[PDB]
Amino acid sequence: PPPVRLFGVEGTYATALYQAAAKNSSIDAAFQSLQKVESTVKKNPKLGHLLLNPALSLKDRNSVIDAIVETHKNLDGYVVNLLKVLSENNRLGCFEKIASDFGVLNDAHNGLLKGTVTSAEPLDPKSFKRIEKALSASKLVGQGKSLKLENVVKPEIKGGLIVELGDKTVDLSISTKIQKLNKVLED
Amino acid sequence: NVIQDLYLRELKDTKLAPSTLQDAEGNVKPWNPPQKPNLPELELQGPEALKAYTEQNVETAH
């Protein structure tokens, strides 16, 4: 069955959407259209993200969908059937969640991998490139797959780096090393 | 790396700590010498006790 099994809270919806669009072949189109309706939802920030709140009727939810595919009509029909499904199933509290999940499945299908370089400060571009190079060089990025390596700032990790991707991490930070050191000097 | 930094920093920057023997003394028991090497007391000198004893107990054999 289609790659990557993400069991989620309505991530079964995403899985279904994914598998459904694989059998329709056009996943990229679907993903793009899903991005567009997500974008116009996001760009209807008040009084359209506040209509993701559960208080609307079944009939009113249905009319919210009809208005949504009206709202900037020209959307794939598979995501309009999905929109209907989510409304009918009266869940839309994981709508952008489903979108994000469909993206993960899609870009997994595409082959793209994500990494992370947590630090307490933005690191050199030389560092960004060097790590991207290193990972690409190693089997860690298997190739036939790409790495969008993202440095993030979290002061939680004071100094160093932690490289993350594929649930494989290497953490050389001052905080973690300090922890182990402290413990050994508390022994 | 960080191991070296800490190792270096700690080792170099501290290598003396307080240590006064006098403060230790307060927390330990003092040695002081035994008392009373007293020689035993001598008693029941003379046959005065014996003569008294032979007489004293009427029953010397019954």
UniProtKB/Swiss-Prot annotation, chain A:
Its main location: mitochondrion. GO terms for cellular component: mitochondrial inner membrane; mitochondrion; proton-transporting ATP synthase complex. Keywords: ATP synthesis, Hydrogen ion transport, Ion transport, Membrane, Mitochondrion, Mitochondrion inner membrane, Transit peptide, Transport. F-type ATPases have 2 components, CF(1) - the catalytic core - and CF(0) - the membrane proton channel. CF(1) has five subunits: alpha(3), beta(3), gamma(1), delta(1), epsilon(1). CF(0) has three main subunits: a, b and c. Belongs to the ATPase delta chain family. Mitochondrial membrane ATP synthase (F(1)F(0) ATP synthase or Complex V) produces ATP from ADP in the presence of a proton gradient across the membrane which is generated by electron transport complexes of the respiratory chain. F-type ATPases consist of two structural domains, F(1) - containing the extramembraneous catalytic core and F(0) - containing the membrane proton channel, linked together by a central stalk and a peripheral stalk. During catalysis, ATP synthesis in the catalytic domain of F(1) is coupled via a rotary mechanism of the central stalk subunits to proton translocation. Present with 32400 molecules/cell in log phase SD medium. This is ATP synthase subunit 5, mitochondrial. It comes from Saccharomyces cerevisiae (strain ATCC 204508 / S288c). The gene is ATP5.
From Swiss-Prot, chain B:
It comes from the Eukaryota. The keyword Transit peptide applies. The keyword Iron does not apply. One of its GO terms (biological process) is mitochondrial proton-transporting ATP synthase complex assembly. Keywords: ATP synthesis, CF(0), Hydrogen ion transport, Ion transport, Membrane, Mitochondrion, Mitochondrion inner membrane, Transit peptide, Transport. GO terms for cellular component: mitochondrial inner membrane; mitochondrion; proton-transporting ATP synthase complex. It is found in: Mitochondrion; Mitochondrion inner membrane. Belongs to the ATPase h subunit family. Mitochondrial membrane ATP synthase (F(1)F(0) ATP synthase or Complex V) produces ATP from ADP in the presence of a proton gradient across the membrane which is generated by electron transport complexes of the respiratory chain. F-type ATPases consist of two structural domains, F(1) - containing the extramembraneous catalytic core and F(0) - containing the membrane proton channel, linked together by a central stalk and a peripheral stalk. During catalysis, ATP synthesis in the catalytic domain of F(1) is coupled via a rotary mechanism of the central stalk subunits to proton translocation. Present with 6140 molecules/cell in log phase SD medium. F-type ATPases have 2 components, CF(1) - the catalytic core - and CF(0) - the membrane proton channel. In yeast, the dimeric form of ATP synthase consists of 17 polypeptides: alpha, beta, gamma, delta, epsilon, 4 (B), 5 (OSCP), 6 (A), 8, 9 (C), d, E (Tim11), f, g, h, i/j and k. This is ATP synthase subunit H, mitochondrial.
